[PDB]
Amino acid sequence: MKEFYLTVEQIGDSIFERYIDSNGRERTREVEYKPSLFAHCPESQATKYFDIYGKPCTRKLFANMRDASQWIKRMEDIGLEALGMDDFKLAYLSDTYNYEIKYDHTKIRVANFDIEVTSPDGFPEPSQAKHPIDAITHYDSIDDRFYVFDLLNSPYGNVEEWSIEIAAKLQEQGGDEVPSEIIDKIIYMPFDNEKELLMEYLNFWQQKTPVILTGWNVESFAIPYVYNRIKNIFGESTAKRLSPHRKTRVKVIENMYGSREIITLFGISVLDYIDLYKKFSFTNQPSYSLDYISEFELNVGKLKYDGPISKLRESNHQRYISYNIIAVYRVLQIDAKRQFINLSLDMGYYAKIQIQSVFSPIKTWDAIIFNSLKEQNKVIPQGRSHPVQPYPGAFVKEPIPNRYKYVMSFDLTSLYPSIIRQVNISPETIAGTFKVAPLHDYINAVAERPSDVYSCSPNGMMYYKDRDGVVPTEITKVFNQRKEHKGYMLAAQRNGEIIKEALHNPNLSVDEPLDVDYRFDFSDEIKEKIKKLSAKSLNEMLFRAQRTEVAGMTAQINRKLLINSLYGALGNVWFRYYDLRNATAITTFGQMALQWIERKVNEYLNEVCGTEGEAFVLYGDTDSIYVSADKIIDKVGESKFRDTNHWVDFLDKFARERMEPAIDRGFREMCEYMNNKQHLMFMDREAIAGPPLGSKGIGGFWTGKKRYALNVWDMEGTRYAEPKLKIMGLETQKSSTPKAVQKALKECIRRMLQEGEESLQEYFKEFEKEFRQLNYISIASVSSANNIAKYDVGGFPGPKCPFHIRGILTYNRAIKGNIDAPQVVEGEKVYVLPLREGNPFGDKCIAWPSGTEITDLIKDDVLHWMDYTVLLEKTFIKPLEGFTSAAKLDYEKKASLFDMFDFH
DNA sequence: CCGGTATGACAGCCGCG
DNA sequence: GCGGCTGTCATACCG
C-alpha cells in the first residue's frame, strides 16, 4: 500500500509527522526538515526555477527552519521579495508525498467524544473547569467501540452502576432506547473517584491517540474542559499528554463581536462537527444544538428527560449515561448521511494540506496551485499584506413590483470560474490597461473595441491570449477532473444496468470474479464472458460496481466544491494570488454578461413577437435572467392548450430550439467584441413557472430585489408531477420567521399562485380565528444575539437598543438571581416574543435561548401577557400585504382601491 | 485568513397653528 | 407629539 500522512506539525527546527507506513501501521517521526526558499537572481545565473512571471530564481537551501524564516524577515526589512512556500509544513507534505495520494480511512483513527459535567450554578465554564467530569463517552472508528467512562462518586451524588440491560429496553419498559446496532459495541468502565477516571482516560488516550477529533461543540467545550480539568488537578505536564507530541497552545479566537479561547493539541486534527455542518450543509438553522440538528437530519424524536440537566445524574443516572452515549452516536449517524468527515479528508489529501485547513478555502487552493507549479519547476510568489477595500460586485436588476403569469428563467454555468477562463484572468497574464467607457456603452456595444490583440474586461483590464494562466489552467484541471469522473460514474451506470438481466439467467459452478476495471466501461470482448459466470459472483461484481459508482460521485462533488470556492479565495486579501483589479475584472464582466444577454434576449423576442421596445426580461440576478413568457403564450392563446403540461412543453420546446441559439449567438458576439481567449458563457433554460391551466392563480410575483415566488413545473428538463413553490428571499425562507407563520405564509403564497384571490381570502380569514391555539414556539421570531453588553447599562436598555436585545435585558431582569435558569450566550440565537402594555417585566418584549422550551420560572406569566394581535400584525399581516400589494391581490373581503395611493 | 440588498427598529431632524 | 424622511445599525438573505 502507498504511504500517506495523518497529522503534520512544526515545533522549532523539526517537523513532527504522524503517518501510515507501507505495512498499514501508524508511525511517528521527528524530522529536521531542510526547507528551500527562493530569491531573485541575475540573468546570467542558470537554474530550472522561474517565478510565475518567468523571471529567474536561485534555490536557497537552509540548514533549519529557523534560518529560513529569519531570512524572510531580513528580506522584509529592506524591500526585496522572498519567493517560495513560507508554510514549511506544506512544503514538507509535497516533498514526502510527490504523487497522487491514495488514502485508506480504515487506518485513520477518527474519534468523537462527548463529556457530561454536573453544574448546579449554571453553565460549567471550560476556562475554569471547576466541576468534576462525571461522564465521558469516546467512540473509536478503528475499534468500532464506544468507550464509556462513568464516575460513580462525586460532590453531587453517589450513584449506582449503569445497566446495559436497562439501556436496551423500550421507553415504556424502564427508559433508554439505545439501538441494537451499537449495544454490542459499548465498553463500560465505572470509577470510584474522578482522579482514577481522568487518569485511565488519559492512558486510554495514549493507547488510542486520535488523528481526527470530532463531536458537537468539541473544540469550544469538551477539549478545553478536559484539558483544564486535568491541568488543574494534576498539572500542565499531565494535561499536555493529550497531545501526542506533548505540546499544547491556548488560542484566542476573536469575531467582529466578542472573544473566546480554545486549546490547540499539536498532533491532532480537530474537526468540530458544528463547524463542519455550518460550512458544508448550506442551509441556515434556527438552532445549532445537537438535538435540533439530529431532529432535522435523522427525523429522530425528542431525547427527553425529567427535570433540569443539573439534577439528572442525581435523579436518573441510568438515563444520564445513556443520553451521553446517544449524543455521541447522533454525530455518528449524521456523518453517515452527510459524509462531511470523508469529504474533508478527501479534499485535504487532494490538496496535500492538514485536514483542519479545509475550513479555509485560502489554504486549500494555495496548496493545489503550489503542487502543480512545483512539477513545472516554478516558484510561487510572496504573500503581500494587501489593504482591504471592497471592489464592485454583481449586477441585480430592479424589478417592477408586479404579478407575472408565465416565467422562464435562464442560468449561466459556473459564471465566475467561467469568466476567469474566458478572459484568462491571472496575476501573470495582466497584459495592460485601456481607457474605459461607461458599462452601458459596452452593454449596448457603442464604445470602441477595447483591444485588437488582448483579452479584455469592462473594468479596463487586458490579458494575454497566448499565455496559459496559472489560475485559469488550474481551474480547467478541476473542471476536467469533474468531467472525467462523469466518465467513471456513468460508465458504472452502464455496467449496473446489465446486472438484473445477468442475474435473471445465471449459471453457478465456481465463484470467479476476475479483476477488470469498473471505471472504464466494458466492451463486447469482456461482456460476452461475464454473463455466463457464477450466480454468487455476480453479486460481488455488482457490489464493487456500486462502490465505484458512488466513489465517482464522491470525488465529483469535491471538484464542484473546489470550483465554487475559487472566486472567494481570489477576492481575499490574504490570498497569495490576490489582485484587486483581477477580482474587479471577474465581477464587472459578469455585470456586462448579464445585461448584455438581457439586451439580446429583449431584441430577439421583439422580432419574433412583432413588437418594439417591450421589456421581456423582468429580473436578472448575478448569473440568472427571468423572462416573462406572457406574449409568447398569448401568441397561440391560452384556451388552445388542453392541459397544464401542454403549455409547459411548448415553452420548453421554444427555449430549446428558438431561445438557446439566440443566447448562444449573443454571447459569441460578446466574446469577439471583448476579444476573449475562449467562449465559455453557456446559458441554459432553468425553470418554467405558471399557474394551473383553467385556474384563477397568478403564477408568480416579485416585490423587489431578491424577493420573489414562483410556481414551477419544470427544472432543467425535469417535469414535476405536483408543482413546487420556488420562494426566494421572502419571509418563508428566512430563519427569523416563526415556524407556524412560516408555513401559513407559504400556504397563502400557494393559494395565490395556484388557486387565486377568492381562496387566499378564505384561508386568511380562518387563520385569524385559530392563530392563538398554535404552539408558542412556532409563533416566536428568531434572532442572533450579538453585542448584548454594548447596549447593556445596568440591566437597562441604552441608546439605540435593538428589539431582540431589549428582550434579553428583560430576560435578565426576569431571571434576576436565579443561577439555575438557562443563560443567553452571546453569538447563540434567541427566541423573541412581544408582550402588551401593562406587563410585569418592564419593556415590551422578552427573549429566551433558541431551540428550547422557556423556563418554568417565567412560562407561568409569559404565556399570559404575550400580545397576539401585535404578533399577528408584525409577523403575519404586515408581510402578507407585502405580497398581496405587489401581486395586486386583496387578502381581506373588502378593501378600498384608494388605500394604495401615496396621496397628499 | 470566501459583494449586493432586503426588512425591522431606533433616533436625529425638519416642518407641523 | 404627530407623521414624514433619512441615516444608521443589526440581521439575513441572493448568487
UniProtKB/Swiss-Prot annotation:
Recite the UniProt keywords alphabetically: DNA replication, DNA-binding, DNA-directed DNA polymerase, Exonuclease, Hydrolase, Magnesium, Metal-binding, Multifunctional enzyme, Nuclease, Nucleotidyltransferase, Transferase, Viral DNA replication
Beta hairpin, as annotated region = 248-264
GO biological-process terms attached to the record: bidirectional double-stranded viral DNA replication; DNA-templated DNA replication
Q: What does this protein do?
A: Replicates the viral genomic DNA. This polymerase possesses two enzymatic activities: DNA synthesis (polymerase) and an exonucleolytic activity that degrades single-stranded DNA in the 3'- to 5'-direction for proofreading purpose.
The domain-related comment in the record is: The N-terminus contains the 3'-5' exonuclease activity. The C-terminus contains the polymerase activity and is involved in binding to the polymerase clamp protein. A beta hairpin structure is necessary for the proofreading function of the polymerase.
Q: Which InterPro entries does its entry note?
A: DNA-dir_DNA_pol_B (IPR006172), DNA-dir_DNA_pol_B_CS (IPR017964), DNA-dir_DNA_pol_B_exonuc (IPR006133), DNA-dir_DNA_pol_B_multi_dom (IPR006134), DNA/RNA_pol_sf (IPR043502), DNA_pol_palm_dom_sf (IPR023211), DNA_pol_type-B (IPR050240), DPOL_T4 (IPR034749)
Please state what the protein is called.
Answer: DNA-directed DNA polymerase
Q: Domain of life, per the record?
A: Viruses
Q: Where does substrate bind?
A: S414, L415, Y416, R482, K560
Q: Name one GO molecular function term.
A: metal ion binding
* Organism encoding this protein: Escherichia phage RB69
Outcome, altering L561A: No effect on the ability to recognize damaged DNA. Increase in probability of nucleotide incorporation
Regarding protein family, the annotation reads: Belongs to the DNA polymerase type-B family.
Site described as Optimization of metal coordination by the polymerase active site, located at D621, K706
* CDD domains the UniProt entry points to: DEDDy_DNA_polB_exo, POLBc
Per the UniProt entry, the disulfide pairs are none
Name the coenzymes or cofactors required.
Mg(2+)
Q: Where is this region: Interaction with the polymerase clamp?
A: 897-903
Query: EC annotation?
Result: 2.7.7.7, 3.1.11.-
Q: Where is this site: Essential for viral replication?
A: D714
Residues involved in Mg(2+) 2 binding: A222, A327
* Residue positions binding Mg(2+) 4: D411, L412, D623
